[PDB]
C-alpha positions in Angstrom: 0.0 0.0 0.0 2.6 2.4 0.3 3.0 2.6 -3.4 -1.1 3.4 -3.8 -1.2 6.5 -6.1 -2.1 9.3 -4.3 -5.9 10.6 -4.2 -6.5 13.9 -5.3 -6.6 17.1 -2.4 -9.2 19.9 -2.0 -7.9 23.4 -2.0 -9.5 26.9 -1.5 -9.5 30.0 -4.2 -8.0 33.3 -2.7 -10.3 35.9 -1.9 -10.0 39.1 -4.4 -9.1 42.5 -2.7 -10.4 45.8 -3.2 -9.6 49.7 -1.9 -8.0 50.0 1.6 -7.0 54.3 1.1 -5.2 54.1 4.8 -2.3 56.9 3.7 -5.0 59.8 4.3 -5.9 58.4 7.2 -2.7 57.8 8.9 -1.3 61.4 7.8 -4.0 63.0 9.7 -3.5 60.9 12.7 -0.2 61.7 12.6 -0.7 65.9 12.5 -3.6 65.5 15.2 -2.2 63.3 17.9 1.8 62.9 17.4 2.1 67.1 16.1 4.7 66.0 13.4 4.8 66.9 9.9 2.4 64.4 8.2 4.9 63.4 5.5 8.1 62.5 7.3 6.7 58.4 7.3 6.6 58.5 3.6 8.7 56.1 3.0 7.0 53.8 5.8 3.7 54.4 4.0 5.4 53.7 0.6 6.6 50.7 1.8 3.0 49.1 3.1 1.5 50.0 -0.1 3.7 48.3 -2.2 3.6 45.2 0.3 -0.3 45.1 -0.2 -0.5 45.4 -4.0 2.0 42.4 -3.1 0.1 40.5 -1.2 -3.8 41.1 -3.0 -1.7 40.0 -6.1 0.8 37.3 -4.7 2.4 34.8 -6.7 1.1 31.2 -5.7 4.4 29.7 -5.3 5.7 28.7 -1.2 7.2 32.6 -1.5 3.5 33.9 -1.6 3.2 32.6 2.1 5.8 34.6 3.4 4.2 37.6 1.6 1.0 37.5 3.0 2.8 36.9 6.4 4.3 40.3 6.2 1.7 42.1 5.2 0.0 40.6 8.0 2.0 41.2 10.7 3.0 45.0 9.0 -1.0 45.8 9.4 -1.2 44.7 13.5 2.1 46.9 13.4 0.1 49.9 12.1 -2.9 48.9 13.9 -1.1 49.3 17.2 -0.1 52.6 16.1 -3.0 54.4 14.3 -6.7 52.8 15.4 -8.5 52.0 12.3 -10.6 49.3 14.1 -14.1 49.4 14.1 -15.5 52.8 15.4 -12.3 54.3 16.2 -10.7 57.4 14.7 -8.4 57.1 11.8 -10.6 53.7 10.2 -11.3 54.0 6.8 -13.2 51.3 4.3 -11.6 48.3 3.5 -13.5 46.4 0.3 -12.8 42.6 -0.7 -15.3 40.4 -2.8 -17.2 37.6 -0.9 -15.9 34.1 -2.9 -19.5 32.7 -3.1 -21.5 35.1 -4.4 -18.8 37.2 -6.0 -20.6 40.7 -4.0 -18.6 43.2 -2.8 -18.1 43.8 1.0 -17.2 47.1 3.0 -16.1 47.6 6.3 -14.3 50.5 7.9 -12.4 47.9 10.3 -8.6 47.1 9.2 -9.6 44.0 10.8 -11.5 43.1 8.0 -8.1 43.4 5.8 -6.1 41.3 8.8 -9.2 38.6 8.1 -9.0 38.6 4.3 -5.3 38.5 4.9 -5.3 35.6 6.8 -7.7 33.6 5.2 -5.8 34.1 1.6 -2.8 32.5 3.4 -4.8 29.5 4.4 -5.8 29.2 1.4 -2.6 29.4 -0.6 -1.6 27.2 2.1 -4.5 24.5 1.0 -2.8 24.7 -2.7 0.7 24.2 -1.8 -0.8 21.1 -0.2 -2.5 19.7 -2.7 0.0 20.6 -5.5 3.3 18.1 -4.1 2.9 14.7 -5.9 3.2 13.4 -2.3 5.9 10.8 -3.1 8.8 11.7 -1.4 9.5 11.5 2.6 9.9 15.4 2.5 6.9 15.8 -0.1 4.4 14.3 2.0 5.9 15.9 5.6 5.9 18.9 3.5 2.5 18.7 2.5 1.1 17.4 5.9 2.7 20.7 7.7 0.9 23.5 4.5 -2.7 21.2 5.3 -2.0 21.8 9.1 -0.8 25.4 8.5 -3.9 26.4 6.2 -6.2 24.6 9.1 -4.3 27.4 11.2 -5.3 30.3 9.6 -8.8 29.5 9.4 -9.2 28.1 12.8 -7.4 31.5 13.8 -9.6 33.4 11.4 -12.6 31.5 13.2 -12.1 32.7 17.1 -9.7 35.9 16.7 -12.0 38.1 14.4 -15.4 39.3 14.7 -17.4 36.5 13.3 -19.0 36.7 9.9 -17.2 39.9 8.2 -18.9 37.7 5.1 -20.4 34.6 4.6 -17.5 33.0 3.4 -15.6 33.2 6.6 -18.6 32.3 8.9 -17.7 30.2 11.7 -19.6 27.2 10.3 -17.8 27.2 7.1 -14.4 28.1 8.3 -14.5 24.9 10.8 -16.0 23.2 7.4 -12.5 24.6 5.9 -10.8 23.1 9.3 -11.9 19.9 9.3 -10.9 19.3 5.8 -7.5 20.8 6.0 -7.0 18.2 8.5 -8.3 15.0 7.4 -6.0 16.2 4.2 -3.2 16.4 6.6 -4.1 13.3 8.1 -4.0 11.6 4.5 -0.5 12.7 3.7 0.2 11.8 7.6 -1.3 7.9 6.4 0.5 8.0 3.2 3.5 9.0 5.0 3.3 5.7 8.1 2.8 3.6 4.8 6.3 4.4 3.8 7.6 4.6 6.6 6.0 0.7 7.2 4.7 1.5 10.6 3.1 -1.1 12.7 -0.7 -2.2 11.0 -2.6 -1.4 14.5 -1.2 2.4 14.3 -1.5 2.5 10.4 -5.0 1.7 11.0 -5.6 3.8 13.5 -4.4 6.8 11.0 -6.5 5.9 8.5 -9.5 5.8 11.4 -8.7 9.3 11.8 -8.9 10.3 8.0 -12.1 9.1 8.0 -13.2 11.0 11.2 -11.8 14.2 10.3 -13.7 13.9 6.5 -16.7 13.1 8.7 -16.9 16.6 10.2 -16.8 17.5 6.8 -19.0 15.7 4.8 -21.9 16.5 7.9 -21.0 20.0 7.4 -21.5 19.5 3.5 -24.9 18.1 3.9 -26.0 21.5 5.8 -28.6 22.6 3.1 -27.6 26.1 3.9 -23.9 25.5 2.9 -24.9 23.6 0.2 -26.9 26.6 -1.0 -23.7 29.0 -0.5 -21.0 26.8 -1.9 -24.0 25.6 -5.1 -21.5 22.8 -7.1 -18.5 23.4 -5.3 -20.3 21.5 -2.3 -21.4 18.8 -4.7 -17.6 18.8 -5.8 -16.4 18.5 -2.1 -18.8 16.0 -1.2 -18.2 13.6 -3.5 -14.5 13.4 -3.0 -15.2 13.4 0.8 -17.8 10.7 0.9 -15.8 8.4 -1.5 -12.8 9.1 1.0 -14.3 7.8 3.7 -15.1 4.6 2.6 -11.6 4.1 1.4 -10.2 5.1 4.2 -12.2 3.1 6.6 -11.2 0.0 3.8 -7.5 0.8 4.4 -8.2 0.8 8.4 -9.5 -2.4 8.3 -6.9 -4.0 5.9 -4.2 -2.9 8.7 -6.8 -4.5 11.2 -6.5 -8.0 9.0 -2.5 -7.5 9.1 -2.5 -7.3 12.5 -4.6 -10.3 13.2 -2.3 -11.6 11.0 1.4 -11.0 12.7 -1.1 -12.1 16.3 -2.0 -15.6 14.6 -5.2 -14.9 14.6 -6.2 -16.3 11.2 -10.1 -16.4 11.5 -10.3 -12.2 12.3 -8.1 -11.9 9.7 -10.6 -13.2 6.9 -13.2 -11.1 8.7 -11.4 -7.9 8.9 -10.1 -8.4 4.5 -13.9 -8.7 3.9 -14.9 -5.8 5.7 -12.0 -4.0 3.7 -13.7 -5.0 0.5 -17.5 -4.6 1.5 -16.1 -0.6 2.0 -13.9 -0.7 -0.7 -16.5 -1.6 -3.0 -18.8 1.0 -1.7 -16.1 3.4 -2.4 -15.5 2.6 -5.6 -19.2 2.7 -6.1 -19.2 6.4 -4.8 -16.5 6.7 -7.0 -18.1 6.8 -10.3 -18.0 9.6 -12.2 -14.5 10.7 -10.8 -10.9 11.2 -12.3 -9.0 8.3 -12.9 -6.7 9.4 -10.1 -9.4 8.6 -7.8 -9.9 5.1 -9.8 -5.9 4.4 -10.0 -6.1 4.4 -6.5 -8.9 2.4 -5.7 -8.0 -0.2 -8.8 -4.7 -0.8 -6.7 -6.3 -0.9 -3.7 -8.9 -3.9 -5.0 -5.8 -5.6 -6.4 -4.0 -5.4 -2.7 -7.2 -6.3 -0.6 -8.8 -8.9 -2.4 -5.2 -10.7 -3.4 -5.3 -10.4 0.6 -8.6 -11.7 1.2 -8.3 -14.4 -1.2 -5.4 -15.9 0.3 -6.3 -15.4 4.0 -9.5 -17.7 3.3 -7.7 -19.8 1.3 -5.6 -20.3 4.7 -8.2 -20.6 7.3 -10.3 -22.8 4.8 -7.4 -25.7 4.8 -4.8 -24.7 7.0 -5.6 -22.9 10.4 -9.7 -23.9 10.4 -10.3 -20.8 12.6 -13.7 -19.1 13.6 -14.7 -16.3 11.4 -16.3 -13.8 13.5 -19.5 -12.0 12.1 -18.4 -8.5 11.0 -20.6 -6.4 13.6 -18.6 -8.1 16.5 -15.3 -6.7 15.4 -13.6 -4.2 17.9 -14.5 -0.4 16.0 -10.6 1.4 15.6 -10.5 4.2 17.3 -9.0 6.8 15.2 -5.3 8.5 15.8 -5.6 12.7 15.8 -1.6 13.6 14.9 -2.7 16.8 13.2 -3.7 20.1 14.3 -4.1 23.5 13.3 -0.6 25.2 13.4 0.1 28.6 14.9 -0.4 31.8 13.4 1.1 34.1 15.5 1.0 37.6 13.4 3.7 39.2 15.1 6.4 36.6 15.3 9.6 39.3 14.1 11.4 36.3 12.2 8.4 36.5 9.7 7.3 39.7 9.7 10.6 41.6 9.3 11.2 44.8 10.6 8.5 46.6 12.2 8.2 49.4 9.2 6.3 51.7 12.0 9.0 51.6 14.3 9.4 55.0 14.3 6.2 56.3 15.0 5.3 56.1 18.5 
């Protein structure tokens, strides 16, 4: 199994930007609360201008992140500097377009850049992920840690911000966005103990966890209000998700049959291959229709579990004469969590760079 190809991964469009005039805004300040001439920080404004059109435009490459990351952290740097919050003096609109409906969205809250910020780096994040071919060591830690880190912006997003600036970063849907960065960070993380050959009991409990994780998801996905906002792209989700969690649950139970296996216990064995194949072949039947990426995998799955299962009967039939225990009595496998959404802390110098405003007061 560690040579299965690798299923396709889910990644999230970037939100596009609009206006954010904050020069005006900070030169007043400036005059009316430090007394200073409003153009000696210039070159500090000139500098967070040319990071934004930057970052609203940013190349999708592993170089975008760090972009984004600047930006970022240089707009808490102002904020702490010049209030542009919600309410407070020196805010002026901010304008991005809401992904599902395409509408354009004001606030006069620099928050609301900070959030459209943040969520473009979880979603570049998502793409990096999905775009490795996943078949080195490094490629598929690699990949694991950009599914974990976009799962970190949006769970960041989902309790450091105002809730529901738009609709595509309500709390429902960015958990929705949460849950399936990390069951696609679980995936690379299963891939990964494949490789590595790691003992069948935690392999399966790994591949427990995928399916847990695309769970969340795929409940989520049957929300008819989500449904309604995301139109085909939920269709498109949950497709891929529900197929995925029959496949994985078949690869949890094949692990479950090689343990039995290495423990002598010839009779489970058979029971845990068939299980394999009753969900693999509900898989592959929620797999029609899909990309023959999708079918690669699952044809080389088949060819691994039922080879398997074939044999194991074969075994207990003339050899070991064991009990075959009804399916519904096997032990369930309690699923392995070794993701989670990684930090975002804004402010961290070694990513931000200098503080531009570090002359101001």
């Amino acid at each position: 199994m560690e040579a299965v190809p690798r299923m396709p991964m889910i990644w999230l469009d970037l939100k596009e930007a609009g206006d954010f005039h904050f020069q005006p805004a900070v030169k007043k300040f400036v005059l009316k609360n430090y007394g200073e001439n409003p153009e000696a920080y210039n070159e500090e404004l000139k500098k967070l201008e040319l990071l934004r059109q930057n970052a609203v435009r940013v190349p999708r490459d592993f170089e975008g992140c760090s972009v984004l990351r600047k930006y970022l952290g240089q707009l808490h740097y102002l904020q702490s500097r010049v209030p542009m919050g919600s309410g407070q003096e020196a805010a002026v609109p901010v304008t991005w377009t809401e992904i599902f409906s395409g509408k354009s969205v004001a606030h006069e809250d620099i928050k609301y850049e900070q959030a459209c910020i943040l969520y473009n780096l979880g979603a570049l994040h998502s793409m990096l992920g999905a775009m490795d071919k996943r078949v080195s060591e490094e490629g598929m830690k690699v990949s694991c840690t950009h599914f974990q880190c976009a799962a970190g912006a949006f769970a960041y997003l989902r309790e450091h911000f105002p809730q529901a600036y738009s609709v595509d970063m309500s709390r429902q849907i960015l958990t929705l966005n949460v849950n399936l960065m990390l069951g696609q960070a679980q995936e690379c993380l299963l891939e990964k103990s494949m490789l590595d050959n790691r003992k069948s009991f935690l392999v399966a409990r790994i591949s427990a966890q995928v399916v847990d994780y695309y769970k969340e998801a795929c409940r989520a996905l049957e929300n008819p209000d989500t449904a309604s906002l995301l139109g085909r792209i939920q269709k498109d989700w949950k497709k891929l998700v529900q197929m995925k969690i029959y496949y994985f649950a078949a690869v949890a139970h094949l692990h479950m049959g090689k343990q039995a296996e290495e423990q002598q216990k010839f009779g489970e064995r058979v029971a845990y291959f068939q299980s394999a194949l009753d969900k693999l072949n509900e898989a592959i039947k929620l797999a029609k229709g899909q990309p023959d990426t999708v079918q690669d995998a699952l044809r080389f799955t088949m060819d691994v579990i039922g080879g398997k299962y074939n044999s194991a009967k074969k075994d207990n039939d003339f050899i070991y004469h064991e009990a075959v225990p009804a399916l519904d009595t096997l032990q369930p496998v309690k699923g392995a969590p070794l993701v989670k959404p990684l930090p975002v802390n804004p402010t961290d110098p070694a990513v931000t760079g200098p503080d531009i405003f570090a002359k101001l007061v």
